[PDB]
Design a protein around this ligand. Sequence first.
Ligand SMILES: Cc1ncc(COP(=O)(O)O)c(C=O)c1O
Ligand SMILES: Cc1ncc(COP(=O)(O)O)c(C=O)c1O
Lengths: 393, 393
Amino acid sequence: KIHHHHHHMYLMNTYSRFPATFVYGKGSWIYDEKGNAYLDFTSGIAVNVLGHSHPRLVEAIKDQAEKLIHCSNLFWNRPQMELAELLSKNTFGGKVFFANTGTEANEAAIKIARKYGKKKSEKKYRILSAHNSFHGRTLGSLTATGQPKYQKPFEPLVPGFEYFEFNNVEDLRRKMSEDVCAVFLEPIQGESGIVPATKEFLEEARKLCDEYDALLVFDEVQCGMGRTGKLFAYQKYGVVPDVLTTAKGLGGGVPIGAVIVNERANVLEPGDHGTTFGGNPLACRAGVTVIKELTKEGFLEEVEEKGNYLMKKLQEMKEEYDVVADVRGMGLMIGIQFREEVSNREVATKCFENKLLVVPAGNNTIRFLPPLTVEYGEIDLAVETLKKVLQGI
Amino acid sequence: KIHHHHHHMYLMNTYSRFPATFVYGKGSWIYDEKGNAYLDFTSGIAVNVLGHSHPRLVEAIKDQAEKLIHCSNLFWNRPQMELAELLSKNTFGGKVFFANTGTEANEAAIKIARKYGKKKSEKKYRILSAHNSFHGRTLGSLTATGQPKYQKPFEPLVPGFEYFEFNNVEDLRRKMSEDVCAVFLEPIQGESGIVPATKEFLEEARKLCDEYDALLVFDEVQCGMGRTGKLFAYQKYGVVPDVLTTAKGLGGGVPIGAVIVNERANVLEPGDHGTTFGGNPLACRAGVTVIKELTKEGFLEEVEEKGNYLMKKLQEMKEEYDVVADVRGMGLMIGIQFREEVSNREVATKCFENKLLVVPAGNNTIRFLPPLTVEYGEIDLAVETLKKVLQGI
Ligand SMILES: Cc1ncc(COP(=O)(O)O)c(C=O)c1O
Ligand SMILES: Cc1ncc(COP(=O)(O)O)c(C=O)c1O
């Protein structure tokens, strides 16, 4: 009875969805109400880092729910303290604020940057972000998101934001001034179609932020929590931000977000910012379980090997298939761009019809975002399914 | 063992906390790491509607976690669809959008209002909200939040917001214009110290929104989900908004938020707004469990009786204790205001020392926000403990 053909009318029409009602999932597979199995190379849009309903995650959720779900930030709880320690120790050693989502994490970052700048000067509230970036949908994050189509209906947005071309050193440099309090960057742009930063570009952004006394903020909501083959992309690049935001895979499915700051950026005082749900024991328990799994000896090294193997197969496909214009990415975050004559959305629909789930993105791309636990055989099955789709496109 | 005495070092200093690490809770009671039991009249700030770790909620969480935690809004899931149906049918019959938090629900409402306004005119983007309101900390919601102390460090905020005095018909009338797309009101202001709207004031807001073609938006994040003795406060008042926002108690401790719209306010299109985590099956399963419990025959009527019983005891206390200036609220949302010579924060600390947890708010108040499952004897115990505190204050 409860099915998308019957219950759609209770939901606002905010999404373009594939026509499936999913009721059960394990690992890389998800099942509709009829028991049809789908190979899930979406991971819920880069969230299901350990796949669906991973047994260790499920056991931690069950255990914690029996003990304490929510107490608020009037008090301290053990999962929140443990997760803050683990995030600090596995990054650049700073302090943590828990939010519930990526956009909320980025909003906290914006607020940190504004407070940092305002201490120096009332004029130092400008924020730079990239054209084609995606930082979230709440109004602060939406102003940072360098995509007019998402902004226009909701204007006027937050004053003081300006945009530069991703990977264009000189364009970033020429937009800097002493009035800038932060530069926001995705180390790999996601929604725009999987576009890795060059190391030179990130190194430049770091130097500029140092020269103009601005905070360098890396949005690792999509590329973070193991997906590049290191815990965070910044660790692959060797460029350390002042502020790092994370969400998506942090909870392995359970909603959570976080901001990590160095001492320079540790500017918030009691009352400046907060959240009812953020830092709750249930979500933080999930995050503890996830970070412990990802940091086990050898886990990330095997993600890197799997990323290399998937990339090799897709590069072979790119050479062979004239409709494939480009393949790019890092680790298990990979975009496949098609020639203009072929619709990315049609490719995704045909994949879906053949029981493979992929995520469309800009620049006429689909994204392969499998769970980090994805098996070599599942990688091959996904590539073969995509090839079969392209043969008939 | 993990404890706030050490682990505070990993957390940003964004909160003024009571000095307790809590590890376990059931019902109206929460326990520290030493096994001391505290009577929790915070409900995690109006969140734990069924108390801590209610067995039916816990069972639902465990069952859903074993099945499917997160699939994203690329697809449909049964809990999301069921919860949307239940929210629609138990309110004014509209459509639902799932967010993760109160602030995110209010951000969606702002965006709905702007989309609505822009259909009529490019100038019709202005939003009105009340002085001393609280709508959230993300930058859209923060602009709606009528509290300069929370805004100033982060300016400039979103242009086009203006404020009026809560319960002041003349001030609301003055601020209306054809360029207003929404009026935001908490039916009972929470953070300001539990200040119910008058029915007259809400009826006037409804008439004015009709006259100026604006959306009336009720923020029921704190007063909703059963706390006033009806599912939503608007149902006690008999004034129906165009848009309703809810979070906190919706998930019984699991993070979730929602916006409900009538057809007039049903204006978002695919791509206009979205969220990774919003509408996930785990959180929506919690929401289904909660709404089914609250809507059981007699449940809300008993919340009303308990509210009346608590209010009677507090009114007797007010008459008896000169340091108590006022008691106000509705159902189990109650504020106790002290004479200026007595610090609400000192009262809350002394309650804490005597194993009763309460939530400070504005206007020199403490808030009693017990779970809606609070027992009559627990009510008496809280009141007796408070009285003992006031005897030595
Ligand atoms: C890089 C990036 N930042 C922020 C977000 C927003 O995260 P959320 O949907 O959890 O609010 C996303 C999700 O699309 C993202 O890809
Ligand atoms: C009336 C009201 N609106 C919005 C919010 C913000 O909710 P959240 O902390 O879940 O973002 C709250 C919480 O303080 C609330 O009391």
